[PDB]
């Protein structure tokens, strides 16, 4: 007649990390970090992304003659670019407000290209002025989307045009002015010089002054030409009034749908998928809550820690028993549960589990790893932006913000999981130690400590005592006095 | 014969947050967030703010017709201003660097108005324009702290002003240019074309050229009004020259007090308290640490958590013998004695146990709001509409400083819940472990928590049994005795 | 023969502070934080740093009369500016993008100053203009490295410039245009009204028109000067074009080292010392891993908390067996093992926890020292005057992320230290249980720490309880013959 007290063990080879012990091996443990990728650029829930290929955003909107196949773009859910694209403007210049405009963008679903000022109307002007930098087939061509006003015999009169927003959204518009290279090309361009280019909202008012410099050759050519932009609200006005050096819109672009979207910064290609979020690398597939393959990500998975290992452990040490109790090391027979209750009758023996403790510490268990879990869903997200050239300062201020937050994340995470991991075994082996102190305790003192976690009853039982003794109802005064005849001997 | 060990229990029913549990009940708990407020909007130690009313920034420094009751304002301490003010710029036009002012004047108080350049030193222009967009009774009216200057006559001779700064302080002047809807509007207005607007200091240098375009009508009229500012030092001068399109100011506004203020969105009206400190929904009274109404708070009151529930648990485990439960009839201390001479009985606590306890639960509440009083301050900024990215630039570092702050809060919060119970039931535990040993052999446990005496002794023996001067080779012999029997 | 159970005592007066308790007395303790500095400027690996003394970047690039010292100057590892500068402008006027150009200068090594475009080559008019605002004993002076450029006679011509950038690496070039205070003025330097200065590149196009104001004289003069620059690539090539108003360069400065380096605020000199660390009140030389003196470092050196004492408790509480305190006679180790025979006595240790707790607690320390390691690092910048928000927003976030790392490592070691002093406790009680369970019950404990043996051992019984090899079966009979 003896029982014994011990714990639950198998053959498992995980290993977890500690804030005093590093690589311990355990009986379970939980992962949280997803290392893994398919490597590809593909849809995202049904909608395919929008391939800019090695046209830019500035050669889309404005319609480069390469950038022929997006005159009539579908619904996207995100933005494909290059890190330097080839075709972007095809004339040597510039855009003013650039990173505004692609801020704006990162949020706005497709677009709808309306024709706010036909290509016709111009009947007291030339419109089928081209270069040679944006050629086609040999031939000099121009943008798809802009008409170049020249003079048409030896008169530029004043240029009028005017829009009233009647779509029913919001319409973003692109006008420019040229600058050439000498006097004698804006008299052979234009036959005026002073010239300017008005434009006039309910809340714009721009007058601009043509700038004639000499410089290098881009593209083949000395002169430059300045684009800006306007998002015109409903029911608004646009005017448009110049002498010269006009390079007026054809068509204007109404937003339609808007979201949630961005601007993803690739080198690869268009496949076949449906994945829920999607990475610069590849595309995630995963139900874990942390991963750490890019910071930036587009859809709806999980947060970005810049670790190598997390692992949450979720049972007990795994050391055995080299070659009967606690002391020494658990049990395989063990089946049943964690902590052990051995027993051992005359008539023979059992390996039944305690279910009370059992049912405690996986409760305890479950709200730990839940909490862990919850406690970080408040993360930092970081969202995408671009700078210009003489923006230096603060660029690297975004920068900083976001690789700080990630770091204060990241050390947090890691030392949420090591003091977890403390805590959960120095649980576990108080767990097994008071399980012990209480059966020491109702035992009394009628046994026979044997020292290895375990005492032989100094009152001879059966298997209906042995049984009562684990439900806890082992009555001291119902076995006192032969147990006492007992230990006389 | 015998004594029993054990703890404190009551009747409270306060709920406190633990690692692995939620919901335990306590005995003694310490709330530390404050979640109420009065719902006015009203003083800061006295001093009334500076109500706008249906009034901006720029209506109220430029002189809008319809703010007309802001002409002369006392100190304040903070200022109201609604999200889509309706009295602006009548005339309209636009306003460059808004936001940088706004910022200066985020802790400026009281300023004073100097009339720098008065309206009838101008004797070769017309003075009295004005126009419907700024419509008093019907007639036309203008700004009441600008000028418009036209033609007299048939002409519109060289226009000069100067103004050296000996007011005593800083002063800020604003001037404007004109810019009108075609040629025709500009000779009647001015005579003259290619025009300019000259101004000069000691660190500004300035030459604007009107810009003559078509534009839809706004408030009824298709020119605009542009406006620029600066800060004058002190003995430093301000020229001002000009052919045409100058709307010249005839008053300078002189920094006077100075401070901490700021710019509260709100659109309600102002009552009458008097509050220590003011969010854009209600004022705070209270003498707790933290508070969870409104990020942005002025005034000097508690910081702000993005939470709903941070209790601090200061006292035992609430359950109705220290292996079975606690007690309901003792009332002295934290950690029990309960003693049962031969002729009486009592229910004593530990008088020594208890003030360690107290002063360490004390010290870490103490060490837990020190802890957290280097936290980070939101502070009210504006962007304007080609500022999109710095606006979310601003938005995620506060956003982002506000839950590293929370998660911090509610992790320290939850740590110390589990590491109160544990030292409680340990200190308990470790009690009875002390006498358990200084008893020595000379008991014998029931095992419900508690021994009975293996030796007979009185009240002053079982005193000092539980005073730490058990003298074991007094009365072992009849023990032992009795034992044998 | 008994055998007792306590922990070394020593000497030591360091102390340490914990969540619960504050101010408590340890055996030994690690530093962590370093908070004195020799307070001298002085050289960093060897390259001595730029000083700039009283002159402004802006004085010194443009050729300030009063900084001819710093004409040619050798490879530096930071540059030292005061706050104020007394010499940078001579000629009244503003500077472009300064706080940019300041930006770029702060990742820039040594400078090669190239001439672009010789002063004799401009042989249509006059080079020799000067003004009194930066003059040379008592005669009229004007910048170095530029260029005014006037009437010759009674014309001044078209005036044009190029340069194809063939040095072989990047080229900062600085121009500037005049902004006279009267139309008598602009014609007795130019003859010319409504005149233009252009200047183009493969990425820079720009006309300026001058603008003339009545404005107050400061040094002297009522005009103004503004000054722009831009950075000339490879094989680029840049040209000037203007009718007036001109403020032409002589030199470039090809960008030659690059590198790590920044702009330092000071108000002091350089001294002789060779140092590894500096900071803007004085060099550093130390090896611990955090420091307090200043948030903005060049070099490699610590990390910077705002706290005044990081002190981590590596031993166990400093009391005169373990129930009644330590003993100062053991130097053996931390857990003891004080044994006694009948022949004689001894205070031997115990070598097996030991070891685990000097491991540990080394663990403890090292991983202590490396989660600090991805800490947030400060980095200067400079704002104008019209730019208060974005001062203000780095200033906050700056401010907030010290605040954040801070209380990090605050609250970091004092649960270090609380958890080592209870281990401590912890293992000296486990020894104290694991030899009373290997007793078994012959012995009585005596109360304080240890047990009176129920049969007399001797040396190899005492060695062998020691080493965990108490057999019961090998000694019980005699024993319970002496328990009568
Ligand atoms: C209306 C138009 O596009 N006209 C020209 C165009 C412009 O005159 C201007 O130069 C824009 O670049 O220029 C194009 O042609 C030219 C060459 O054929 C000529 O040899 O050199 C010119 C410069 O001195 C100019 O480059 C051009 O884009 O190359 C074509 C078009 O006829
Ligand atoms: C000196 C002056 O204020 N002159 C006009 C003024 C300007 O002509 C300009 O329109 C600035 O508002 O405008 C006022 O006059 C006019 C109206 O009464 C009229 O119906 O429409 C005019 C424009 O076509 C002009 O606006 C005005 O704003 O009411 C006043 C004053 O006569
Ligand atoms: C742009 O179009 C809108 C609608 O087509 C114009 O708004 C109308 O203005 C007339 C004024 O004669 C009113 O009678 C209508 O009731 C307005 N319609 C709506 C839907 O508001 C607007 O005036 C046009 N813009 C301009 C500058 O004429
Ligand atoms: C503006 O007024 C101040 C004070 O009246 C002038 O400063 C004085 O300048 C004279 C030079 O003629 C000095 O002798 C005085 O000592 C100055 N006064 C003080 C208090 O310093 C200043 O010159 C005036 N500004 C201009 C442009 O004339
Ligand atoms: C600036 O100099 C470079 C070389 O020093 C010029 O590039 C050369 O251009 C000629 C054209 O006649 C080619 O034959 C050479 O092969 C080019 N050299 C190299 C290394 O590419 C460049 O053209 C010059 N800049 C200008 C505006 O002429
Ligand atoms: C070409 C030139 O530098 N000319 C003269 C300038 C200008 O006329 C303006 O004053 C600009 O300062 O001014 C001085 O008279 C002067 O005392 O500063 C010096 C010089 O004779
Ligand atoms: C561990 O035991 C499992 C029993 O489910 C078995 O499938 C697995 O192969 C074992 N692994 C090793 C290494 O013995
Ligand atoms: C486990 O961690 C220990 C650190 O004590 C290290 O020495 C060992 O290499 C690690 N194991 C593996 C497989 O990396
Ligand atoms: C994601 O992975 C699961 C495996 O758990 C797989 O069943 C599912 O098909 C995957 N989804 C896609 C889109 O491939
Ligand atoms: C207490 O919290 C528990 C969460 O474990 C929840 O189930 C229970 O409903 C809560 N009770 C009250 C009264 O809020
Ligand atoms: C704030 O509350 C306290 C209650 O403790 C009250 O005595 C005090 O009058 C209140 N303050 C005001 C301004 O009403
Ligand atoms: C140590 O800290 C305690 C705070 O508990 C303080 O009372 C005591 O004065 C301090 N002692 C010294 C020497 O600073
Ligand atoms: C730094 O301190 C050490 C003392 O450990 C000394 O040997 C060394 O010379 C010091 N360095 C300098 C540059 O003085």
Request: hydrophobic share 30%.
């Amino acid at each position: 007649d003896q029982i014994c007290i011990g714990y639950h063990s198998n053959n498992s080879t995980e290993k977890v990390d500690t804030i005093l012990e590093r690589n311990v091996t355990v009986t379970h443990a939980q992962d949280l970090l997803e290392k893994t990728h398919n490597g590809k650029l593909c849809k995202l829930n049904g909608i395919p992304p929008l391939e800019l290929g090695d046209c830019s955003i500035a050669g889309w909107l404005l319609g480069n003659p390469e950038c022929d196949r997006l005159l009539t773009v579908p619904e996207w859910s995100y933005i494909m670019e290059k890190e330097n694209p080839r075709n972007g403007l095809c004339y040597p210049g510039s855009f003013n407000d650039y990173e505004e405009l692609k801020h704006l963008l990162s949020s706005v679903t497709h677009f709808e290209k309306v024709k706010i000022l036909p290509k016709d109307r111009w009947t007291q002007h030339t419109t089928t002025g081209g270069s040679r930098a944006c050629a086609v087939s040999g031939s000099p061509s121009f943008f798809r989307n802009m008409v170049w006003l020249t003079k048409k015999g030896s008169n530029y009169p004043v240029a009028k045009g005017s829009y009233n927003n009647t779509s029913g959204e919001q319409m973003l518009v692109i006008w420019g002015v040229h600058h050439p290279n000498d006097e004698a090309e804006q008299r052979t361009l234009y036959q005026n010089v002073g010239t300017y280019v008005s434009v006039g909202t309910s809340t714009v008012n721009k007058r601009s002054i043509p700038e004639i410099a000499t410089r290098p050759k881009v593209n083949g050519q000395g002169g430059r030409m300045e684009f800006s932009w306007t998002i015109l609200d409903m029911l608004d006005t646009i005017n448009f009034e110049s002498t010269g050096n006009l390079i007026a819109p054809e068509y204007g672009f109404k937003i339609s749908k808007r979201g949630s979207s961005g601007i993803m910064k690739t080198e690869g290609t268009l496949e076949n998928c449906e994945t829920k979020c999607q990475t610069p690398l590849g595309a995630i597939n995963t139900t874990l809550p942390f991963h750490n393959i890019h910071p930036l990500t587009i859809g709806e998975c999980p947060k970005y820690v810049k670790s190598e290992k997390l692992v949450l452990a979720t049972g007990l040490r795994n050391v055995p028993q080299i070659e009967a109790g606690f002391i020494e090391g658990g049990w395989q027979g063990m089946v049943d549960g964690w902590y052990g209750y051995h027993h051992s009758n005359d008539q023979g023996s059992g390996y039944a589990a305690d279910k009370e403790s059992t049912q405690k510490a996986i409760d305890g268990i479950t709200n730990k790893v839940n909490s862990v879990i919850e406690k970080m869903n408040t993360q930092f997200e970081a969202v995408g932006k671009e700078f210009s050239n003489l923006e230096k300062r603060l660029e690297n201020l975004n920068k900083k913000m976001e690789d700080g937050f990630l770091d204060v994340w990241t050390y947090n995470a890691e030392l949420l999981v090591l003091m977890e991991n403390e805590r959960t075994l120095d649980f576990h082996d108080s767990n097994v130690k008071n399980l012990y102190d209480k059966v020491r305790m109702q035992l009394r003192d009628n046994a026979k400590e044997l020292g290895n976690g375990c005492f032989e009853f100094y009152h001879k039982c059966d298997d209906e005592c042995m049984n009562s003794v684990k439900n806890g109802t082992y009555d001291y005064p119902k076995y006192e006095e032969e147990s006492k005849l007992n230990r006389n001997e």
